[PDB]
Amino acid sequence: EVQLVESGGGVVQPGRSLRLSCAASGFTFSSYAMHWVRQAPGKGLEWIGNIYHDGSTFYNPSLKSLVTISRDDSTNTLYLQMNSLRAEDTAIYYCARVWLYGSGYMDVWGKGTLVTVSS
Amino acid sequence: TNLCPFGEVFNATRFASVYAWNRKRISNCVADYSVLYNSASFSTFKCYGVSPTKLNDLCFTNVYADSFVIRGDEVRQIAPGQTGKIADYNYKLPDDFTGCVIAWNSNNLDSKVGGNYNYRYRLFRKSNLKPFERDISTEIYQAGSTPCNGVEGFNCYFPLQSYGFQPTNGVGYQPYRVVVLSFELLHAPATVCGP
Ligand SMILES: *[C@@H]1O[C@H](CO)[C@@H](O)[C@H](O)[C@H]1NC(C)=O
């Protein structure tokens, strides 16, 4: 059945890069648009980025040049490259999936990955 | 004596989405409107509060060019007093709007065979937009009777939805480029004049 799993979390130095992976299993990766969302401890959810089948990547206007969304369609996976990590990026990250032929309902969600930045 | 940069607006390679429509201030130039109306490219040339023929004879101030891309059947919503997704949540024109709405089919530039996904509209907002108000803020919103405090409740809807632009789509779903010209009728010294 439908399943989203993530990997790449851990405790890393600030400014060092990270690569978070979201593997999709059970559904064809095409015809759906994939989202990256994060939530900070004590704070609500914050949307990071969108990527489509074309390769069009849309980022949040609040944060610029910190992340890079990279889709891959051979193995139905989604990649996030995070660069120049600041101390405030300690968060739980989620992978989301919307159908392109309906309202923007995010359907199934990833379990989430924990990113802790420390010095 | 210098010409207004309509070529930089109408003949631009890329246009922004309707949620984040581009606003260009046109000032300190002579605007030759006769190359706009007599061009047969524009499917829609509807002017409110001014006749297009008289556009050469009048001097305006604070001319604004608002450029975006919407689908074919939403071009009617770029008018004063219209309702819809674009009028309420994406681009709202005032009731007292003076200016011109110009729209033309751009299927051969803004459609890709697999589907173009660069133009997106704001599907939902909490309240209707004010006239000439831009909402580039992308915020997660709730669904009803359960909060968006994580995955736990009803899953959270996203406001921005992309247009499905394919060249095989029928007319009305095809990409249409819209430029909205807004004027002010003779108050401070005018800077944009015709010949
Ligand atoms: C756009 O390019 C065509 C190419 O000939 C030209 O005729 C037209 O006037 C241009 N549009 C503007 C607004 O200059």
Residue numbers in the entry:
A (entry chain H): 1 to 119
B (entry chain C): 333 to 527
What does the published report state?
SARS-CoV-2 utilizes a trimeric spike glycoprotein for attachment to the host cell receptor angiotensin-converting enzyme 2 (ACE2) and for the subsequent cell entry step which involves the fusion of host cell and viral membranes. Given its crucial role in the viral replicative cycle, the spike protein represents an important therapeutic target and is a critical antigen in host immune responses. All emerging variants contain defining mutations within their spike proteins, with multiple mutations clustering within the receptor-binding domain (RBD) impacting both ACE2 binding and antibody neutralization escape, while mutations within the highly antigenic loops in the N-terminal domain (NTD) across these variants reduce antibody neutralization. Given the rapidly changing mutational and antigenic landscape of the SARS-CoV-2 spike protein, a structural understanding of spike protein mutational effects and the discovery of broadly neutralizing epitopes is of importance.
Analysis of the ab6 footprint reveals the inclusion of L452 and Q493, consistent with the reduced potencies against the Epsilon, Delta, and Kappa spikes, which harbor the L452R mutation, along with the BA.1 and BA. Analysis of the relative neutralization potencies of L452R and Q493R containing variants suggests that ab6 exhibits greater sensitivity to the L452R mutation. To uncover the structural basis for the attenuation of ab6 potency by the L452R mutation, we obtained the cryo-EM structure of the Epsilon spike bound to ab6. Focused refinement enabled visualization of the ab6-Epsilon spike interface at 3 Å, revealing R452 to extend towards the ab6 scaffold. This orientation places the positively charged R452 sidechain in close proximity to a hydrophobic portion of ab6, centered around F58. Thus, the reduced potency observed for R452-containing spikes is likely a result of unfavorable charge and steric effects.
